[PDB]
Symmetry: C2
Subunit: 44 residues, 2 copies
Amino acid sequence: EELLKQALQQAQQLLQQAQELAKEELLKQALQQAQQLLQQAQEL
Amino acid sequence: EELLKQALQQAQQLLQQAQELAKEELLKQALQQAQQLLQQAQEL
């Protein structure tokens, strides 16, 4: 559960990296990685 | 691209709803929905 927290806080930090990249490879990566934390968040 | 922005800004608003729900059904929903915006973000 604090793990879900560690997963969400980091997915949040990563969607924010995606966002500033949006304003290529590193945007792709940041979204992939964030999806990961969210799948963990979902199963957690 | 501003669409990727609209997708990311909203996925961000949703991982934040998940987070406060974390501190059941609505946490599940918020993560599902956020994953959606991120898949759109990825394909976009």
